[model samples]
Target: ITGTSTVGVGRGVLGDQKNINTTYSTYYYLQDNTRGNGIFTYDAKYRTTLPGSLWADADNQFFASYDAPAVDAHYYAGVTYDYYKNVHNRLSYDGNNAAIRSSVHYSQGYNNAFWNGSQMVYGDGDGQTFIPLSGGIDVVAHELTHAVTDYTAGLIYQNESGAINEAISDIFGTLVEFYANKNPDWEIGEDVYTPGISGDSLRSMSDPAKYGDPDHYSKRYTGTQDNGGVHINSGIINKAAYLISQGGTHYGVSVVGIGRDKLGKIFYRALTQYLTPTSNFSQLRAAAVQSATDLYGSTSQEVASVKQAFDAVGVK
Candidate 1:
């Protein structure tokens, strides 16, 4: 609904206070008009139905416990948008300033989140496993990066292509975590995962094997589950991405760290320019190398590091 734009104060799922954009009509709605076309958040009301209702509050002050997920979902979407526009010169996930939409509090005890081609959907995991997924900036970024992949690379979510798809989400999701500069780390979903247990995450880019994910190509999972091991095989690519930014020796192979900014530039170029729907892991390596070459030249350290990083993870 058209209304006067406003700002609301709220505490997120982790009890961090922040301001969120709101639209004040009869009720303050969680619709931000400041960024590009807009960033809209909705209340799923613990149901499977999507985009249930534009989150509405009476006073534009979202301090109630029920308001937490919507707060972060709306706020973090804006942050991810800023990261893309300011860092990569991309407009939105579609490169056309598409209105970013998200739904929170989806289903009781729901343990995961995803981008459903059209919009983002976050689950309020059971208190034992997770709080609300939108509480984690990386979680929000991970799901939204799926939208980016959908629009740009369109990588088929199966086999090696699917693993690449999952890895791309983790790559940019972790990058966006650092971009926001809020307790960022190589781990994914650490913030919202297992409130009772500390120092654990859903996945680790720096050390994918920490949670039993294969960090090298030789150990890649050849299974029928998870769309031919999309989530599992992503560990190999995640390890490579980790090495690109924070180099280390693995399996007697060493990589020179090129830092996060250059790492991001290379991957962004590959995702937007070279990757296709069915691009496999080998194709991804080629795309990254060519991207680095385009950005920093054929002999530049950036190009060299890209090669060594992939080598470290046994991608070739």
Candidate 2:
């Protein structure tokens, strides 16, 4: 909806106060015009609709308990948009000023979020395993990265390709978290995952096995579960990405760190220029090697580290 740009103050799901970009025509709308075309947030009202309705407030201020999820959803969407634009020189998910949309409060006691091929959706957690998922900037960025992957690499959401899809989301999600400089770590969904538990996350790029996920190719689940263990097996690639950025020794194999910015550049180039819908782990290794070479020369430490990281994770 077209409206005058306004700033709204709101508390997030974790009781943190922040300002959000909003629009005011009549009722204030959760629409941010500062990034890309616009970032719009909607209320699902505990239903399963894609985007139930445009959220409206009597005043351009959002500081109520019920407004927490919407505030984070709207604010985080804007942050994710800014990350892509400023870091990647990309306008939006599609490289065109595509409007980013998110629906929060989706379904009762829901504890997950996803990009449904069009927009992002978040669930208000059952209040145990998670809170409002939107509160986690990494979670919001993770889902939005899905759209970016769909547009670029088009990695199919199954088998090794699906694992790559999931891993790319984790990779960029972690990058965005660090880009925002908000208590950043290599953990996915840490902010909104299991509030009752401390130092625990849904998945860990630093050590995916911490959450029972495969950090090595030897442990990759081959069964036809969870879309061929898309979520579980992603740990392999996630660990590789983590090792590339942070340097690590795993199972006596060492990977020299190339830092986060270069890691993101290599992966982004691979995703946009090399990967295909059916590319598997070995193919990913080749793509990463080629991308690092293209960016930093064939004999650069960046290229060597990319290779060592994949080898450490048993990607061959």
Candidate 3:
């Protein structure tokens, strides 16, 4: 939809007010022309279709309860766009300023969100498990980070590659949460998950073991469920990432924190330049070490910390 670019005010799923980009051809459409090619959000209307309908508002203000998911989906896509552009100096997900598209309210009682290869889709949860998933900025960015991974590393979403992909998403997802300065925590899906339960999240990067996810290679899941435990095994990599950024010790191995910015730089460089579809844990260690060495010199503390972080996670 082409029209004068405009900003619309909306209250999100969590009852927070924010401004979203819109286009006004007739009814205001959730088409943001302010960044990249554009950011477009749609409505799934409780169906399984992909990118259902471009969300339209009679007025520029979005405040209805039914509009909450769309509001957050639109606003957070802009924020994720900003995070990539401002922090990584990359355009949209593809580095080519691909228009970001998302759909909200997908299926009744759907409890998850996904990239769907082309665009993002969010589920309005059954209210017991999750609220509108887009309400969680980390989760939103996490899903979009999959797009970033697809374009760059193309890590196969199975086995070790899949776990690496998931860990990368969690890493960037946490980074994006901190980038947005919204009640930041390394815990994933804390905001939108378990609305009735307090202080619970779907996953934790700081302490993956808190949710029974392996924090070390010695504890890695070897079963064939969850695409060879993609989500389950990601804890090993997530712990390494958290150690790289924040410093920690596990199984008697210690890592000195290099801080979050350096962790992001090292991982982003590895993802864009070193990792491949079949890269495994050892390969990730090599990629991170090489990436750190490339960015901060072989003898730099950053390089040493990358090694220590991997060692601390039992990556060898």
Worst 10 residues of 1 by lDDT: 307-316
**Segments in model 2 whose C-alpha atoms lie over 4 Å from true places:** none
Q: Rate the local accuracy (lDDT) of all candidates.
A: 0.93, 0.93, 0.94
TM-score of each: 0.99, 0.99, 0.99
Model 2 Cα lDDT, one tens digit per residue, 1-316: 8779999898999899999888999899999998878999999999997789999999877888889999998888888888888888988999998999999999999999999999999999998999899999999999999999999999999999999999999999999999999899999998999988998999999989988999999999999999999999999999999999999899889999989999999999999999999999999999999999999999999999999999898888
Highest lDDT scorer: 3
lDDT of 1 at 282: 91
Q: What is candidate 2's CA lDDT for residue 289?
A: 97
Q: List the residue pairs that clash in candidate 2.
A: none
lDDT for model 3, please. 0.94
